[PDB]
Structure formats: structure tokens, C-alpha cells
PDB file of C-alpha atoms in Angstrom:
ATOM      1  CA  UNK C   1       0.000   0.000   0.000  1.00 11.28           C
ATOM      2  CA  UNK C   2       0.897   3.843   0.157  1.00 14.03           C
ATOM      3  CA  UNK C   3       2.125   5.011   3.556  1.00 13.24           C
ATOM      4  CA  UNK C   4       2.802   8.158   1.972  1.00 11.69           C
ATOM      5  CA  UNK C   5      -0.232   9.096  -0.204  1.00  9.45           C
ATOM      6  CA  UNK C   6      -1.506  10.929   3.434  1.00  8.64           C
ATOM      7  CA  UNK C   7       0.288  13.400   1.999  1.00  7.57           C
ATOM      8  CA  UNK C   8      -0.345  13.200  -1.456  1.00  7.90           C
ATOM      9  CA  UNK C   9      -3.827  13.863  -0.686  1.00  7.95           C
ATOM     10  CA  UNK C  10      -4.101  15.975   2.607  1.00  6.13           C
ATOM     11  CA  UNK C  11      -1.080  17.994   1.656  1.00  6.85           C
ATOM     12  CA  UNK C  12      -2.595  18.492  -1.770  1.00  7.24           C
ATOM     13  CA  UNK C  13      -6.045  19.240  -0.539  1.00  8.06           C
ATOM     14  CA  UNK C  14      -4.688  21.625   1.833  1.00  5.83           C
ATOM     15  CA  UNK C  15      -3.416  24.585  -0.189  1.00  6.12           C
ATOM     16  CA  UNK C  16      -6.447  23.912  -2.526  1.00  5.69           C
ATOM     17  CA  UNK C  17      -8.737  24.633   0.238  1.00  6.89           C
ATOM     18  CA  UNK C  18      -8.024  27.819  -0.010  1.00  4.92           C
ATOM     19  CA  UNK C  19     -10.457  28.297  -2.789  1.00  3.71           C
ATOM     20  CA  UNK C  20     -12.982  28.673   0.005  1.00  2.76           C
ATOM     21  CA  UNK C  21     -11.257  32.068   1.056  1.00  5.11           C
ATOM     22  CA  UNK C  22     -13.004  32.879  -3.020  1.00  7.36           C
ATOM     23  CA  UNK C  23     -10.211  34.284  -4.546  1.00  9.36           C
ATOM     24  CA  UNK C  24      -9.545  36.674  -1.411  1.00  9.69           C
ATOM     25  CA  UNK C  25      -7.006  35.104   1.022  1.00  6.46           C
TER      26      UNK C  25
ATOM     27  CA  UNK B   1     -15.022  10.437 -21.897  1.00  3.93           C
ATOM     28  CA  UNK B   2     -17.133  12.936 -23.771  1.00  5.62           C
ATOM     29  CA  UNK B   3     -18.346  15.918 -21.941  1.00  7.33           C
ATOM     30  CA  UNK B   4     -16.392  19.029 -23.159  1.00  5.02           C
ATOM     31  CA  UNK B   5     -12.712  18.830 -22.014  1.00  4.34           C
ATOM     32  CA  UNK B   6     -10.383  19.506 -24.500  1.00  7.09           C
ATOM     33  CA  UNK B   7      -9.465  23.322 -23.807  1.00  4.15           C
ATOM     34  CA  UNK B   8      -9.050  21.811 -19.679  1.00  2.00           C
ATOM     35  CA  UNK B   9      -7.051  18.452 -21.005  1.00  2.00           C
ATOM     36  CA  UNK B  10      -4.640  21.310 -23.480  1.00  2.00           C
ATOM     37  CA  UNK B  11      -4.743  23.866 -19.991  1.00  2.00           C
ATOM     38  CA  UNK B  12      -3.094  21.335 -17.781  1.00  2.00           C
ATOM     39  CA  UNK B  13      -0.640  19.961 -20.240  1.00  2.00           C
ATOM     40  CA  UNK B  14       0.609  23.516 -20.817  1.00  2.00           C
ATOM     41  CA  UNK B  15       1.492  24.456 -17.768  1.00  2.00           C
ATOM     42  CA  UNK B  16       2.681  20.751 -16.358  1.00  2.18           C
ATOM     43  CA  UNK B  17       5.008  20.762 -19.690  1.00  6.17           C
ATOM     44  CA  UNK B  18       6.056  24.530 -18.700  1.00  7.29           C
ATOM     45  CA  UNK B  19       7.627  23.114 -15.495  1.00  6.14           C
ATOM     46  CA  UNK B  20       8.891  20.190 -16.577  1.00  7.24           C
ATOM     47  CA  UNK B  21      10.598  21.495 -19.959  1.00  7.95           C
ATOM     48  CA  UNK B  22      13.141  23.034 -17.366  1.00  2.00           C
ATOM     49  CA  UNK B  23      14.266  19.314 -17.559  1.00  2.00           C
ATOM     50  CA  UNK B  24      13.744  18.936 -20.988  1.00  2.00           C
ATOM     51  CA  UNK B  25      10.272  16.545 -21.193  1.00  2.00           C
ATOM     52  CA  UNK B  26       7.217  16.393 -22.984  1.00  2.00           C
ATOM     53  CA  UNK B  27       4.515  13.241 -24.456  1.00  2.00           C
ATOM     54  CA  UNK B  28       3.749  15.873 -26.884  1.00  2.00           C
ATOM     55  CA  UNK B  29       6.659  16.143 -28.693  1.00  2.00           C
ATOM     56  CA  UNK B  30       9.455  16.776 -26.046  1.00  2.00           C
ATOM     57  CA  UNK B  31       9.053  20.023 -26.813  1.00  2.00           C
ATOM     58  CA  UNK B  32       5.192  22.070 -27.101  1.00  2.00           C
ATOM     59  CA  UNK B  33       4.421  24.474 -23.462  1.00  2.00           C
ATOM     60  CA  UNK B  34       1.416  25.678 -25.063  1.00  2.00           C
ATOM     61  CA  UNK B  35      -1.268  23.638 -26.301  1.00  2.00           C
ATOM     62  CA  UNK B  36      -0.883  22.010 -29.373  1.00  2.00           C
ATOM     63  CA  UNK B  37      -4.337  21.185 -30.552  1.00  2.00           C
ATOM     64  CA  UNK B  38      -6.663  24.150 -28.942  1.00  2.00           C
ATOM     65  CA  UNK B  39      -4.900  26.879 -30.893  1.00  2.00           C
ATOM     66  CA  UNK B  40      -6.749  29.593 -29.400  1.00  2.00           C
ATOM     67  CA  UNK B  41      -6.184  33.432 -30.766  1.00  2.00           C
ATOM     68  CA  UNK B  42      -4.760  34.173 -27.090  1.00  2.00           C
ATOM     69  CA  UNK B  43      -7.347  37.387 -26.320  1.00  2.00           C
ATOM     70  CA  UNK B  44     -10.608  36.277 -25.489  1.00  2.00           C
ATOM     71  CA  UNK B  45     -10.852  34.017 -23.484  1.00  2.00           C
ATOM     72  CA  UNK B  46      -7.491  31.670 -23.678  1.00  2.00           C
ATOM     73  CA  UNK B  47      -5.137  34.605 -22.846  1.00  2.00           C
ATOM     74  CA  UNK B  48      -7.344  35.556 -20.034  1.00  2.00           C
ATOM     75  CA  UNK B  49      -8.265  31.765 -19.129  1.00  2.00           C
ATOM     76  CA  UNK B  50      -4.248  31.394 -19.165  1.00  2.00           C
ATOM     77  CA  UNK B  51      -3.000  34.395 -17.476  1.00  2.00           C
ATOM     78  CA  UNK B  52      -5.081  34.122 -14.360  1.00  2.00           C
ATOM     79  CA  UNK B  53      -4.273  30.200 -14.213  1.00  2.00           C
ATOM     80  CA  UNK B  54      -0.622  31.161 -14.064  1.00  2.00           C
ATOM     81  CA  UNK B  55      -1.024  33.931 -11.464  1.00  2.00           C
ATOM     82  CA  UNK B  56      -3.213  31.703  -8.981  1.00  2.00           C
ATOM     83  CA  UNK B  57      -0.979  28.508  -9.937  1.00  2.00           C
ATOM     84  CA  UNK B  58       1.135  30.281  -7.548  1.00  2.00           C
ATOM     85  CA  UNK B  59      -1.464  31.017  -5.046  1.00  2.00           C
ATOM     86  CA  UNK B  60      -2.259  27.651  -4.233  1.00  2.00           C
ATOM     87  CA  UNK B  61      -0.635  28.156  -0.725  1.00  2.00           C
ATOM     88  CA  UNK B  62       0.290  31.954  -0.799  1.00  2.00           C
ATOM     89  CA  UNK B  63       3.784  32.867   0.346  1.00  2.00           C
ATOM     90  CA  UNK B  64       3.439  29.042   1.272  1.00  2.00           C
ATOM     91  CA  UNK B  65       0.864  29.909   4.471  1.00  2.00           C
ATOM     92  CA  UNK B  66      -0.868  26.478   4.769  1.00  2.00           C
ATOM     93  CA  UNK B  67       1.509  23.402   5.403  1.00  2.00           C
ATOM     94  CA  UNK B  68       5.433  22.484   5.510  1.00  2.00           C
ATOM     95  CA  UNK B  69       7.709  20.780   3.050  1.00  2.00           C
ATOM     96  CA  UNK B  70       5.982  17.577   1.197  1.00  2.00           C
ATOM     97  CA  UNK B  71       6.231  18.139  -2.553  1.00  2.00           C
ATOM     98  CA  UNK B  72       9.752  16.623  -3.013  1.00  2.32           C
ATOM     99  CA  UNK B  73      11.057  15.161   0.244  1.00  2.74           C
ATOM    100  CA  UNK B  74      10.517  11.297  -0.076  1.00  2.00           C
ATOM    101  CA  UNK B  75       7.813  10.809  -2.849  1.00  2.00           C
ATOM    102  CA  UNK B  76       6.684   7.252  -2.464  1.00  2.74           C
ATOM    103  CA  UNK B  77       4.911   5.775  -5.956  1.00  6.06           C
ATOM    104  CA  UNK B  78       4.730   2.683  -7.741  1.00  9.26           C
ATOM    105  CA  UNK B  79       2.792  -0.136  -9.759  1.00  9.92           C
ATOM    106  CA  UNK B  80       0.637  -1.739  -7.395  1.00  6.53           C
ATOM    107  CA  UNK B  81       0.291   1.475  -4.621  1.00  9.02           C
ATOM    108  CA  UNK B  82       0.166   4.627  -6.427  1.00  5.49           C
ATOM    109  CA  UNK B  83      -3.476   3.475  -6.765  1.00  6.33           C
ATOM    110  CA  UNK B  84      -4.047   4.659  -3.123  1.00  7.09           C
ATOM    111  CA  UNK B  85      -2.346   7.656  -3.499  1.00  6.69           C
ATOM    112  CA  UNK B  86      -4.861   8.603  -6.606  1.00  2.00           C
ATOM    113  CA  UNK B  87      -7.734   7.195  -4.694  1.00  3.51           C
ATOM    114  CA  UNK B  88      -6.551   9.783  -1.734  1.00  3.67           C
ATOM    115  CA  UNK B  89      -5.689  12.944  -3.936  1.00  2.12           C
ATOM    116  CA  UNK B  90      -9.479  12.718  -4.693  1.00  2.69           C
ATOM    117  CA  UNK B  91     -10.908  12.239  -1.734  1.00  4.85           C
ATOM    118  CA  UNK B  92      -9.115  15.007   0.261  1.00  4.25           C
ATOM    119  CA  UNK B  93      -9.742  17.194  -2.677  1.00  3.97           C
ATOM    120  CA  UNK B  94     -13.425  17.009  -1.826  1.00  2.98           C
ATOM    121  CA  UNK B  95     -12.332  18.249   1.980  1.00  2.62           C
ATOM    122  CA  UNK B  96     -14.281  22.004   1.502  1.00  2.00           C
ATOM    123  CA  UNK B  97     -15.177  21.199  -2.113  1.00  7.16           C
ATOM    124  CA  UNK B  98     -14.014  20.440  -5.522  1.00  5.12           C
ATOM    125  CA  UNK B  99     -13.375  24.383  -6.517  1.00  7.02           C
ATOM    126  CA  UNK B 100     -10.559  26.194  -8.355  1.00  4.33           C
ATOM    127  CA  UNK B 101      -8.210  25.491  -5.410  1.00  2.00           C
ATOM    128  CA  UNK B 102      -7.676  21.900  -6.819  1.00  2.00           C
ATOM    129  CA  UNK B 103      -6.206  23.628 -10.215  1.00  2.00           C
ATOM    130  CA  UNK B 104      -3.896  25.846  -8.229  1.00  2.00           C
ATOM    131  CA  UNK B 105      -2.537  22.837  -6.284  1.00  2.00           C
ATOM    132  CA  UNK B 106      -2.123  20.258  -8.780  1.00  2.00           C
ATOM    133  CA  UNK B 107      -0.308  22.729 -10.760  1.00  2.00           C
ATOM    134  CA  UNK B 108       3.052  23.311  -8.449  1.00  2.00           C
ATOM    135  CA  UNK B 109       2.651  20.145  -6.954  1.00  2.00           C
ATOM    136  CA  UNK B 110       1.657  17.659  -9.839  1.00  2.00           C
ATOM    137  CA  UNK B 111       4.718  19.646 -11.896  1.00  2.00           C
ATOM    138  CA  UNK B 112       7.210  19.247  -8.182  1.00  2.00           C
ATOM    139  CA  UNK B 113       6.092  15.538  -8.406  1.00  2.00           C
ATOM    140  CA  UNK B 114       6.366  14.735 -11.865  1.00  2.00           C
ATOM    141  CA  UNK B 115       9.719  16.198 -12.096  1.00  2.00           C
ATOM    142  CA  UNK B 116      10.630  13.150  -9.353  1.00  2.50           C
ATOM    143  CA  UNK B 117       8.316  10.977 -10.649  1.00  3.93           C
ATOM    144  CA  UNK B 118       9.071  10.853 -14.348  1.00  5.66           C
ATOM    145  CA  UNK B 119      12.780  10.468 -13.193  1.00  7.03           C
ATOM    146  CA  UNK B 120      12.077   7.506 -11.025  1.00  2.00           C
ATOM    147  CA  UNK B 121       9.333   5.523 -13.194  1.00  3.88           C
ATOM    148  CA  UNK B 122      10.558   6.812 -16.584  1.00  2.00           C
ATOM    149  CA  UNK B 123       8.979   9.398 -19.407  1.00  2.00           C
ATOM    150  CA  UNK B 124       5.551   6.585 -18.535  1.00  2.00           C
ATOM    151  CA  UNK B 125       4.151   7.818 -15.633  1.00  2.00           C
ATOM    152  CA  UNK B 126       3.550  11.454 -16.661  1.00  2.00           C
ATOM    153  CA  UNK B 127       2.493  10.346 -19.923  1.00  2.78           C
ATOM    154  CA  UNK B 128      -0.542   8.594 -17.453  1.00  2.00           C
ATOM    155  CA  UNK B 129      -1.074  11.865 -15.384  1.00  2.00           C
ATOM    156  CA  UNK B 130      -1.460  14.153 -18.604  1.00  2.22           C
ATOM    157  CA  UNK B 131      -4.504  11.329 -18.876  1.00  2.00           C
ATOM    158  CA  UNK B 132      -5.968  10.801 -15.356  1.00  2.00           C
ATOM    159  CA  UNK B 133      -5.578  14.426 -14.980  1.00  2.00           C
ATOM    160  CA  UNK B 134      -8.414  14.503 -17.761  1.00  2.00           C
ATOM    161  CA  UNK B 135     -10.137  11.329 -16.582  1.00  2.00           C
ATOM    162  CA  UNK B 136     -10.194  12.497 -12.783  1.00  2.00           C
ATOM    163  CA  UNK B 137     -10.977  16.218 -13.633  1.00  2.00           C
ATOM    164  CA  UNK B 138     -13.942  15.381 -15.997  1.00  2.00           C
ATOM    165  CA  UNK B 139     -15.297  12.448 -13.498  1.00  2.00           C
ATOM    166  CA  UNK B 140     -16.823  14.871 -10.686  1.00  2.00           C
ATOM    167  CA  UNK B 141     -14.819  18.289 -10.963  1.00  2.00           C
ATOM    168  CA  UNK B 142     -15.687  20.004 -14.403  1.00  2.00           C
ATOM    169  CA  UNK B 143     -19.441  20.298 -13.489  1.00  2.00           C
ATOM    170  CA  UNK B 144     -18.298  21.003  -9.653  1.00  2.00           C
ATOM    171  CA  UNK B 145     -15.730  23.591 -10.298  1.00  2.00           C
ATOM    172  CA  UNK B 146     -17.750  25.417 -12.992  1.00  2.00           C
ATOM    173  CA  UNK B 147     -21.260  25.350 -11.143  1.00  2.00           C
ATOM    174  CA  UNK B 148     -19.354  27.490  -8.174  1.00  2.00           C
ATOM    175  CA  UNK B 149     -17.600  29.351 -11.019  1.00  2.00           C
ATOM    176  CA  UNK B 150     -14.100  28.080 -10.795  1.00  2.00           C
ATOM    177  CA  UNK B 151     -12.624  30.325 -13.965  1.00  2.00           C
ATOM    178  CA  UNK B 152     -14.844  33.008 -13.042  1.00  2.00           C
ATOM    179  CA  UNK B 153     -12.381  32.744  -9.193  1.00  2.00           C
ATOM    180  CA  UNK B 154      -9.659  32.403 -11.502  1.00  2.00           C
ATOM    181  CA  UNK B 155     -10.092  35.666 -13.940  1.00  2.00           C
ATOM    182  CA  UNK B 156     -11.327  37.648 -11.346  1.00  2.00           C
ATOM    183  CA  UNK B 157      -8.014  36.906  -8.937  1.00  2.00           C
ATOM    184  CA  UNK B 158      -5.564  38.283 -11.653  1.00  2.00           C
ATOM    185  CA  UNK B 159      -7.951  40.709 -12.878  1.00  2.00           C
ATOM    186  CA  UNK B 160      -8.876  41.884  -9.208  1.00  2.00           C
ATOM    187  CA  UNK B 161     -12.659  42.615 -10.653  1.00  2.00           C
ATOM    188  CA  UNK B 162     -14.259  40.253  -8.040  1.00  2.00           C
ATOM    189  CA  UNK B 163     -15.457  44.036  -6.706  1.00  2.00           C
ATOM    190  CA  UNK B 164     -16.415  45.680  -9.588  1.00  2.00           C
ATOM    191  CA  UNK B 165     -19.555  44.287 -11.089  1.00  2.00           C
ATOM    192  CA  UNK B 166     -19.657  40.367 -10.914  1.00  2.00           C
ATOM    193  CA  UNK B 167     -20.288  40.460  -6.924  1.00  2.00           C
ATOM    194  CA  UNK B 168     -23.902  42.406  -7.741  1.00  2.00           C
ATOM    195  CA  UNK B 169     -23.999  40.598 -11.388  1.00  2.00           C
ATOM    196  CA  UNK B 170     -24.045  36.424 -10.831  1.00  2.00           C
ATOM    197  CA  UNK B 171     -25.681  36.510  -7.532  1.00  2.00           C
ATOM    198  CA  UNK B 172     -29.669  37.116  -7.728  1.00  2.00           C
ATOM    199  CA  UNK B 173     -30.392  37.050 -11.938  1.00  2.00           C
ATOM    200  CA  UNK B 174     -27.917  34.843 -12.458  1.00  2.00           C
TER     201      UNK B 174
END
């Protein structure tokens, strides 16, 4: 399995969620 | 498969084969960091489109405000448990909600991981994520990402119009 892909998806997810900030940060 | 995603399957590839020509790589041709197929007049809609995709590609994290060091340190892939990573990408993308974000964070991080990942499984794994990327994308984000307005974040972040008439525009007729 992938140990790793916690990050691969949590990591990833988590400068993406800034989309709920709607363009202002 | 068929739902209107050949400008977003051309976006991608553009800006993934940006990164990566640095090292010299491309399923293209080796060689393309534009499009090769859309062939848009670039003012309209693709220079705009393209132009605020590059300025929020950079955005994803801002000044990198949101987590530490994890897009080159390590890496783990292979054939027989990347499919949990993919499985995982997807699901954590859907943590707030499929939106723009997910554009702005594949794009550093799917080019800081291909640049790893095409040097330790070959030029055959980013050949597969020019595909998934399409695959994945069109599955349950096109329709997601556009019904909140995902390009309309995008234009309106290197435009900075957010505040001048779409705020009042797309939000009671609309």
C-alpha cells in the first residue's frame, strides 16, 4: 500500500482549500 | 469520456510541460508548453483563461501559508500502490469542495512531483497523469468547479474585478 499518499492527498487538498477564502485570502 | 474537455485536457498539459521542460520533457513532442491542438487566438478568453491560471498557480498556498515541506522530500509511488495515493488525492480534494483550489494545487505540486516521478518511473508515468488528470478532472470536478464558477475565481483573482460588477452581477439574476 501507500504510507505516503496521506500526503499526497491531505497535503494536496490543503493549499487547494483555499479556494474557500473565493479568490480573497 | 465525452463531456467538453479539450481546452481543460490542453490547460493542464501547458502548464505541467512549462515546469517540466526546465528538464527537458514532454509526451507531446518533447518540446510544445502551449497547447498544441486548442490553438486559441490568445485574447478572449485563452489569454485571459491562461494568465489568471498562471497567477493563482502560484497562489495555491500563498507565500506558502498552509503546510510544511511535502512536494519533493521522499515521494513514495509505484505499480501496485500509487493506486491509493490517486484514490486519496481525490478524496481530500473534496475536503471544503471540488473548486478552483484543486487547479492551483495540482499545478506546483503535480509539476514538483512529476519532475521526481518521471525520473524515477521513466517518461511513462507522466504520460498517465497528462490522462488521469483529464479522466479524474472530468469524473466529478468540471461540473463542480464550474457550477461554483471556478474560472470566473480564476479571472477575477488576476484581474482583481471580483469588486467591480460580478459580486452584484451572478448573484440574484444569475
Amino acid at each position: 500500500e501507500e504510507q505516503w499518499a496521506r500526503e499526497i492527498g491531505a497535503q494536496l487538498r490543503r493549499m487547494a482549500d483555499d479556494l474557500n477564502a473565493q479568490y480573497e485570502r | 469520456m465525452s463531456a467538453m474537455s479539450q481546452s481543460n485536457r490542453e490547460l493542464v498539459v501547458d502548464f505541467l510541460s512549462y515546469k517540466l521542460s526546465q528538464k527537458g520533457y514532454s509526451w507531446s513532442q518533447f518540446s510544445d508548453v502551449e497547447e498544441n491542438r486548442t490553438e486559441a487566438p490568445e485574447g478572449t478568453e485563452s489569454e485571459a483563461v491562461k494568465q489568471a491560471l498562471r497567477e493563482a498557480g502560484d497562489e495555491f498556498e500563498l507565500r506558502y501559508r498552509r503546510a510544511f515541506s511535502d512536494l519533493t522530500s521522499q515521494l513514495h509511488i509505484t505499480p501496485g500502490t500509487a493506486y491509493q495515493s490517486f484514490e486519496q488525492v481525490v478524496n481530500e480534494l473534496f475536503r471544503d469542495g471540488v473548486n478552483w483550489g484543486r487547479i492551483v494545487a495540482f499545478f506546483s505540486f503535480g509539476g514538483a512531483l512529476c519532475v521526481e516521478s518521471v525520473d524515477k518511473e521513466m517518461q511513462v508515468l507522466v504520460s498517465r497523469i497528462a490522462a488521469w488528470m483529464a479522466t479524474y478532472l472530468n469524473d466529478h470536478l468540471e461540473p463542480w468547479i464550474q457550477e461554483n464558477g471556478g474560472w470566473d475565481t480564476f479571472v477575477e483573482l488576476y484581474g482583481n474585478n471580483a469588486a467591480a460588477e460580478s459580486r452584484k452581477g451572478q448573484e440574484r439574476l444569475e
